[PDB]
Amino acid sequence: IPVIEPLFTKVTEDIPGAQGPVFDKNGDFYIVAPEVEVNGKPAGEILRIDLKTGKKTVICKPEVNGYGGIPAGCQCDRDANQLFVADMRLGLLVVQTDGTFEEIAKKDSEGRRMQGCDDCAFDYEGNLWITAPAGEVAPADYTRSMQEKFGSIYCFTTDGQMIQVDTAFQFPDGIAVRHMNDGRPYQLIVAETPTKKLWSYDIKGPAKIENKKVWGHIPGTHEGGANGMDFDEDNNLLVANWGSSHIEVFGPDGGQPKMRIRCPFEKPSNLHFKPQTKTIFVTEHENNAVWKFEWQRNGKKQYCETLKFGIF
Ligand SMILES: [Ca+2]
Numbered sequence: 001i002p003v004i005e006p007l008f009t010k011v012t013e014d015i016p017g018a019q020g021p022v023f024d025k026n027g028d029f030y031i032v033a034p035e036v037e038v039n040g041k042p043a044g045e046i047l048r049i050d051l052k053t054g055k056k057t058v059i060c061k062p063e064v065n066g067y068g069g070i071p072a073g074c075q076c077d078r079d080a081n082q083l084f085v086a087d088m089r090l091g092l093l094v095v096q097t098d099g100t101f102e103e104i105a106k107k108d109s110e111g112r113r114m115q116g117c118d119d120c121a122f123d124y125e126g127n128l129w130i131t132a133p134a135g136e137v138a139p140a141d142y143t144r145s146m147q148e149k150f151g152s153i154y155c156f157t158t159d160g161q162m163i164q165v166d167t168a169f170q171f172p173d174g175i176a177v178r179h180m181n182d183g184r185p186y187q188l189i190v191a192e193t194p195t196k197k198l199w200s201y202d203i204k205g206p207a208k209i210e211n212k213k214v215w216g217h218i219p220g221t222h223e224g225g226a227n228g229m230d231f232d233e234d235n236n237l238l239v240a241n242w243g244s245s246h247i248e249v250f251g252p253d254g255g256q257p258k259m260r261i262r263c264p265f266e267k268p269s270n271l272h273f274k275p276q277t278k279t280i281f282v283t284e285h286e287n288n289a290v291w292k293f294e295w296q297r298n299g300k301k302q303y304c305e306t307l308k309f310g311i312f
Contacts, residue, residue: 001259001260003259004259004260005262006294007294008293009293010291011049011281011289012055015289016033016037017032017035017044018031018033019227019283020074020085020086020270022075023274023302024076024304025076025078027275029048029049030048030083032045032046032072033046033071034070036061042067042070044071044072044087044089045061046060046074046095047059059097062090064103064138069093070088070090072085073228074086075121075303075304076304078304079308083096083097084122086130088134089134090103091105091114091115091117092154104162115136116133116137119270121177122303122304123303124179124184124306125185126303127207129153129155129165129177129188131153131174131190132151132154133146133169149170151168152169153166155207155209166209169190171192172192173193173226175229176230176237179300185203188200188209191218191227191228191239193225197216198217198239200213200215200216201213217256218244219246220241222244224241224267225243226239226248227239228271230299232295232296232298235300236249236252237249238261238271238280240269242285245265245266246262247261247263265284266286268282270282273299277298279295280294
C-alpha cells in the first residue's frame with residue numbers, strides 16, 4: 001500500500017485525550033479533552049483553539065447533577081451555530097459558543113437508559129448518527145465496550161427522537177455518512193475499534209439502516225484500530241488508525257486502504273478538514289496534541305457548510 005509522509009505542523013498542545021476536532025460556521029476551531037479529571041473523577045472539557053497563536057480557552061466543562069462529562073466527539077449544526085457533542089458520561093450534548101449547554105437525552109425513544117457516546121456525524125438531511133461505546137450514562141457507573149459487545153448506534157432525528165438503530169458492537173467509535181452527488185444520504189460507516197473493522201449500512205431513510213456489512217479492514221495487529229474518520233470531496237474515507245502511526249485512506253468502495261498517511265506519532269485519534277481547504281487537523285493521544293497537514297484535495301462538506309435555503 002502506497003504511503004505518503006506530508007509535513008505535519010503543530011497546532012496546539014497539552015489537551016488530555018485530545019479528540020473531537022471540529023469547525024463551526026464562523027470558521028472557529030474546537031476540540032475536546034475527554035481525559036481531564038479532578039480528584040480522579042471526570043471533568044472533561046470542550047475548548048476553542050485560536051489558530052493564530054495556538055492558545056486554548058475552555059468554553060465548557062459539562063457536568064450534570066455533579067457528574068462530570070467526558071466530551072468525546074463533535075459535529076456543528078447547520079441552522080444554528082451550536083455544537084452537538086457526544087459525551088461518554090452524559091450522552092449527547094448541545095453546546096453553545098458562549099459555553100452553556102444542554103443534555104439531550106437520559107433515555108432513548110424506547111424508554112431505555114441512554115448510553116455514553118463517542119462520536120457523531122450529521123447527514124445532509126440533518127439527522128445525527130452517533131456511536132455509543134460506553135454503557136449507561138451518569139449516574140450509572142461508567143462502563144465501556146472494549147471487552148464486551150454492548151456498544152450501540154443511535155440516530156438523533158430532525159423531529160427530536162433518539163433512536164437506537166443497532167447494538168452489540170465492541171467499542172463503536174468513528175462514524176461517517178456517504179452521500180450521493182445530489183445530496184441524498186445512502187451509506188453509514190462505523191468503526192469498531194478492537195476488531196479492526198469498518199462496518200457499513202445502507203441508509204434507507206431517517207433512522208433507517210439495513211444491509212449491515214464488514215466494509216473495510218484496518219491494517220495492523222497493534223492494540224487499537226480505527227478511531228475518527230471523515231470523507232474528502234471525492235468520497236475517499238480517511239480514518240485515524242490509533243496505534244499504527246497512520247491515517248488510512250479508503251477508496252469509495254472500501255476493502256483495504258488504497259493509501260496510508262504516516263503521522264509523526266503513534267496514536268491519531270480523530271481528524272477534521274478546515275472548510276474550503278485541503279487542510280486536515282489531527283488530534284492524537286501520544287502527545288495529547290493537535291496537528292495539521294495538507295491532503296490531496298478539499299474535504300467533503302460537513303452538514304454545517306450546506307445551505308438550508310440555497311437553490312442548487
Ligand atoms: Ca471529523
